[PDB]
Amino acid sequence: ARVTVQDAVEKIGNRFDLVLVAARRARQMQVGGKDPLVPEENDKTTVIALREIEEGLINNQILDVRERQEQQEQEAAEL
Amino acid sequence: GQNMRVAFMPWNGYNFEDSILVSERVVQEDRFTTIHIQELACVSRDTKL
Amino acid sequence: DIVLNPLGVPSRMNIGQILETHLGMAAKGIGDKINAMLKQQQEVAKLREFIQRAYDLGADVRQKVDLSTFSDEEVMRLAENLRKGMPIATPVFDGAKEA
Amino acid sequence: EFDAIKIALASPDMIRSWSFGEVKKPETINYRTFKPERDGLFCARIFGPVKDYECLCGKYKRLKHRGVICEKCGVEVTQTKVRRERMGHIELASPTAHIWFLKSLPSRIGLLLDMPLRDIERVLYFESYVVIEGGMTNLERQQILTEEQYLDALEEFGDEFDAKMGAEAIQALLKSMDLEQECEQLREELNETNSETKRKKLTKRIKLLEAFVQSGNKPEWMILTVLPVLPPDLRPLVPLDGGRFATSDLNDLYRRVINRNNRLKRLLDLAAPDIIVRNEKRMLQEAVDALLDNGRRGRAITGSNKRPLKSLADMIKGKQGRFRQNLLGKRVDYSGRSVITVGPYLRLHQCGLPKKMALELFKPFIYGKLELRGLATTIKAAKKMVEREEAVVWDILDEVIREHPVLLNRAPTLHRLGIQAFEPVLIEGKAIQLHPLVCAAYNADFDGDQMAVHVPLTLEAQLEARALMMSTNNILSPANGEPIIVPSQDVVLGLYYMTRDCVNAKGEGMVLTGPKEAERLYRSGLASLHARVKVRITEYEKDANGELVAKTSLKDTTVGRAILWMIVPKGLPYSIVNQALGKKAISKMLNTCYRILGLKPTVIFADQIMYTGFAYAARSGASVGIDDMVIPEKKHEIISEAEAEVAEIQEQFQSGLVTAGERYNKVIDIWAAANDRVSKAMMDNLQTETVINRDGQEEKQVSFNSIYMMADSGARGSAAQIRQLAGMRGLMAKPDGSIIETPITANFREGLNVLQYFISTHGARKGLADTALKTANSGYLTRRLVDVAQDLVVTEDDCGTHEGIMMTPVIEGGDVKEPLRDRVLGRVTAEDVLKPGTADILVPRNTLLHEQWCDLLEENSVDAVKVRSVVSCDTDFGVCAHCYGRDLARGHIINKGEAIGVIAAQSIGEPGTQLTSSIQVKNKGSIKLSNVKSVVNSSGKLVITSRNTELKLIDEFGRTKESYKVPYGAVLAKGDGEQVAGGETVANWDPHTMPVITEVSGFVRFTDMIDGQTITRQTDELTGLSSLVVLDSAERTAGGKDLRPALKIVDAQGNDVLIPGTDMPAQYFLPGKAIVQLEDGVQISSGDTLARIPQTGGLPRVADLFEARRPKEPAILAEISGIVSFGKETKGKRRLVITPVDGSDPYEEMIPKWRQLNVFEGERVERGDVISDGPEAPHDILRLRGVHAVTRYIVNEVQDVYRLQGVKINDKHIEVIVRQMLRKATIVNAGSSDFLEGEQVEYSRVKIANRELEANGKVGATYSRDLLGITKASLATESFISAASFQETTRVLTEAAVAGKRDELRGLKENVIVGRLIPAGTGYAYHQDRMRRRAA
Amino acid sequence: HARSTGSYSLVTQQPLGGKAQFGGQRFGEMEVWALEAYGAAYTLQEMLTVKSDDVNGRTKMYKNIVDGNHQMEPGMPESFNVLLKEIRSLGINIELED
Amino acid sequence: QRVLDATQLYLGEIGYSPLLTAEEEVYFARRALRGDVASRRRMIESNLRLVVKIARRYGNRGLALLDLIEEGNLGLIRAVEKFDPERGFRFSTYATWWIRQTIERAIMNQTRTIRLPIHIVKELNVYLRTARELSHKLDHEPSAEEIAEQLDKPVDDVSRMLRLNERITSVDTPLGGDSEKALLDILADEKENGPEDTTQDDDMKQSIVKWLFELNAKQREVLARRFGLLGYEAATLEDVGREIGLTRERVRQIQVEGLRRLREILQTQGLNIEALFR
DNA sequence: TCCCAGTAATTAACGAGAGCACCGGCTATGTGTTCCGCTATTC
DNA sequence: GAATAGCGGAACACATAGCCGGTGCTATACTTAACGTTAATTACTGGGA
Ligand SMILES: [Mg+2]
């Protein structure tokens, strides 16, 4: 369900931070530690990642915040 | 070769650069069905085993 | 049977194939005329008249072929071979003028 | 893992540390068993076992018994891949020299010893003894002795003197050499010397010795003592089928070396006489020196097939070495290829993949899915499922293909549009269906051209191919901002046929309530596709900030142009389809849609354009018949007239009135006239041949002839292939390039005879051989251009400079070639470009000039925009994103990271297959003679006393449309600063008479103008005037050489007329071959003629401009501004004394006296103005007029090769090659820094070293910038691997290895070779992370 | 012709020639320049590391593919180790340093 | 100044010794054989031209010329080592044997890349001489059968010795004439498995371990130590009899039971003998 | 005494498709043992 | 189930013989070996200012 990545590039600049951010997000979803935010339309994890970029609910800041929060939650599992 | 009823007109893009439409009645008539004969070989050597 | 692109002609300038196509249509028209004269059994005489008229044209050619020396079996056997199209020799720089 | 690759000399104990045993026997394997033989070139105790975890005895055979050296065999059980990484070493019985440090032409043993190479090889071949520290009792240290000379010297000196012979002598030299003291001695001698040849020699010797001290090496490691062998699986002995074997050729040379080393060992052990052991060392040393390279030292030793064996250095050099065959480009799995076809139903990000290639490539994904569905629990079942191609493996394939881009690519990959990505669509076929709009990018025809496919496996690559390499992303070319997906040949003819009108078709004059009733009328057959019809359209402007505003109207247009309008998206104005809409008019619609609307409704627009252009050329039925070539009726008349004229001129030539050379250009004249008149008399017959009538008489119009609509519309035709179908096809050439007199006067409709067809066949076999050799040159050109521009990467965001070149429109004598707007579209400014109301800044200083700032310059008519350029960017190791400019294939500024060097190399590389008296103002403007002195002549007009005289036609708006250059000494019919008309011959001069005109008036004298010595008597024998003409210095006597005829002017009152303004006298020493018509004592005026003096390739021009070769006649320039004179004239050399007004006078220059000089020996020349004439090298341009002059010279002189062939290329791509040519800058004075005087350090490093020194309290370095060609500036690189992966490798590895050089892995070929990410695009942020985390 | 994974050549572990030894298409140096001309680094790295040459790398690539995870653990191409041992089999100590 | 190739320098060098007369040779050998090294030096230094003359005939075999000369030099040194002047013979007749035989052994040794021994090369030269004499009797190439006929030796022996005359080809020679394709492009690395067979083995190993842990413990320990599979060593039924279960017959019984359970477990996944063995 | 011009070498030129003694030392070779495995008999 | 016996037989190892495989020796005299570019550039070397 994706032809042009143009609006994703409008969100994340430089055309290359896009590819690194979408790669990190699709690694989150493929190695199944995660689940998609926007619903999948039987798209591959790559295109769900790009549509998540296009809504603007994933970028490098959101990913770093969520990974730091995940590590905090994992550190809260010591007990 | 084989001489065929031809026409010069652009037909819906399927004959765009140098591409060529061919009617199915050409392949029903088997006008271009070439025969190829290959040769396969099998030697039976004398190995040291 | 084959649809071909026209724009490949006037940039590559192989304008000879337009005349090859036209003379192919001429020769195939002659083949279908003999095939129509052969579908009904017309006569070997009228067939001799038409095939000789097809060998007469055009003007100032060699091999005047006189069909009166054919013995009504070779006219039949010649008609059965021409019926898919009268084959036409056009030498290299002696040519077939468009008239 | 590793940061840098270090190369150095390898000691004789490093080689014993790599190695795992001494290869003592020549024999490779056994012959009954095929067991490796102990202990020859394939062993197992040396190089490892042959089978995985298994000895040679086999008594230890498991991974359980890993690592233990055996007892019966000594073979350490490991993996069997250890035979690719274990070396053995040969112990040579005598030392032998290494051939790379001996024969690579700046020979390191030679210039390290300062011993000439002939004397060294006369020692190594045992011919001549050389002293080794015999002392100066009688001899020198590095003096050779011949044999009898040695014998008598040994008679006089049995003791106190030692002269060895051979490689032991050379090794005693090297290990006896001191480095510091010899370097001190050479430094003092370099300090004392003044001859620049010896200065350069001592600089080279000092630099070699200093690199030898700084690296950890010693000099004697150049002489091999322990020779290391390659591991066996890098030179295998694979058995062929049938008891047959095949060897790499290294096993033979290694066997030869081991044989001669064994025989030498036994020859020493038998105590042979010395002749045999000297012949034996000569024989080794050479078996070795062959092994290391074959063909260098004399002739190569050959194998059985009379071919030389492939040595070690042959596996690195050239196209068959590792460097450009196995390491730069590799063969690649998950790949395949096929023939291609059209399939024009595709959307432009799609491609057709067959079900047999796509089943093969996507194999492991289908295994990974068939394990996932439970349809096969293993891989041995999931393999046999896809083996028999079940019904369910075809549903899995449609899943694993769905959003996985593939990578189509044609075979001559030129630019980055030759590899694109497409979401594939499955075809029941065997061919690759491929969208028609992208074959323009690939340069792909469907005549059997094959394309290869590729699979992005990893998750980053499936995003890389979607964000960067997808077809819908690449719509603009990287070379210039032109679109690249333009409709090519069939769609445009269909769109031409739709958007037309005839004078009377069906339904003409009816009114239409929308662009949909236009479809309903035409599909019901009620109106033609060309009928002038009032429709109502509804077009949307976005005049406000994105506000689409409706405005219905009533447009007089066609039923075709109204049907087509529904394809056009919302924002476009209706007047883009209200024309005939040929090929050019489409690409300026599919570009305005890209600019106005954006990317997505242009990618959706190009598909609808193609779908409509195919569908309406289907219904067009547009054929070509033989009656479509209307031969003109006046062709016979024109040819009859031009055949009468040639017979008349042929009679006249026989009447002797004209020669052969005069009737030649008179017959070629009449034939080139009639060839035009035919082609012009048929074009009024082609295009106007429709003469149809609407309600009345007749109306002519543009024709519906089929061969006119395929050339007028630009869809695959021109006006030069026509005129060869109906008109005569003109004159033809011959193999000398000379033009045949009697032209070929038959079109291709009338056919050619035998002779006209034979004549017009050299023109084809000359054109075909041209494209044969042209590709072979143009491959090598872009090969050089890529490697000169590797490491250029957009690394900063603003370098912060205010320098940068100044741009001007290209006014090349007549019209504007390229205007200012198209040169400075998309490049940020360096100064604030301000309107000619110069109190207000029109643009800011650092604005990026897109179109909306281009038009503000186009209204206020600015002529000169100072711009920020690449070659002035102040970035160390890269180019700032401001100084580069726009992205150029993206509308925005360049993204930080993106490697401009390769994309600017390819944009010059790929067009390379398309390569091989009076001045009249022709417009209305004002005359502007620029910056030139010019005196009033005796006729009152203006005659020219300036060399660089420039005529400008300044318009009413202060710009130039016509510029000119005037020679010295031309009478001006007009004056400066005043408006003149067109056709005005403003200046005039004789191209032969060179005037030596004065500036003062009064009674001239012939001072120092005498006969018999200086002048001769050759008066006007035709009229009767005493002409006092001058001979030359080559023919006159030696008493009047420097005594030149001057023109001193006095009056009748005893006073002398001197130069006004100054106190200098007014005399003009005329040189030889001077023809003076005046007299002495007669009055002269200002501007009077004193003495009347008499006087490329397409591709190799680019290949010599980028190489910057010296042209054979350089324009000698003015090396220092000041007055000029002539020194002591030698036999062929006129020592041109250039005296500055204040500076150092004695710069004299030997000019070849036979060359035509230009300066009149007394003129105060500005620095860098011509002394003679000719094409100039860019080396002189650079050294005199600076960097910004050579960066204009090269980009002018190569755009005048590309625009001549009609190829547009933006100039940044040439500015970066200029920037990469001058990376090296030798020093003039070192200053307080740590450099030498005459050394050539790279300018980037000296831009930091003295930068911190001026940041310190010290002084900087004075350096002159230096220009190198692209075969030398790419070969003088810091990273020794990006220079060795190129032309000569044995030079670069040797020069680096004696220097202890160390690649830093900062470019792109090096990171490609080593296998990590390049530091360019997606791999830029990771290298930033690496360089941040390192040194932290 | 198309090859997923076939037979690699002898001295350098790279695929073979076209359609007779079932071989991969050559990704020559001009195509390398074309990939460098984009921002595409990962595609080029996997293309000359793990689709082609890294011997321990591509089995890990294959087992990553068939186990549904498109990662790569690239390493160092084998042809460069061949170049290392070949330059070093002259008298030229060339070493990777860190 | 000589032109510096190795052959011209040597052949110009060797003439700097006058050839010795018979009494001269005998006297020099008398001095040489009692340990005077100068006499050995004179005798070997003079007759180098004999070595070039003898090794002139052995040219255009596998060895280059100077290799033949230097190997003849070794035999000449052997000849002065064992010359007898007491037979009264001229030295050339005795040294000719040693030089000719030590160049013949050199061509038999250092020619073939796969070193055949002496007797195999003499046996092959017997057959090649027989074929050269047999080709003039039937005017075609004599077969292996024809040479085996003319020597009355077994046909398999002559076939083997002629197949040991293979003339081992190069790899780096191009194929098809056009210099684009040598044997490196044709040859496939046959010992190294590609990724397909290498992942089939690892998947099969993990599947085996999974099925074994799907089987009960007493069966799978027998089937683990029985084949050395689950981190064990491949043990005998007698060995695991004394080690785990004292009745060897019961160890066979539990082995057959585990094999039947694993047969069922494999065929539940559809892997039959036709599946794993085609 | 330094510049300078002819001479020779080195680098590059697309892409993908004889003849015998003699000995010794390895190795095939009987052969024993042996050890394992398999089967068959009997409490 | 479990001990015991027979028994094939696979094979492994050990001791030997035998036969591949490396080496030495031969005695009229004998004496110096084997047919193009194209351009550019640079190092070298004899020649001139
Ligand atoms: Mg083509």
Ligand SMILES: [Zn+2]
């Ligand atoms: Zn062993």
Ligand SMILES: [Zn+2]
């Ligand atoms: Zn900058």
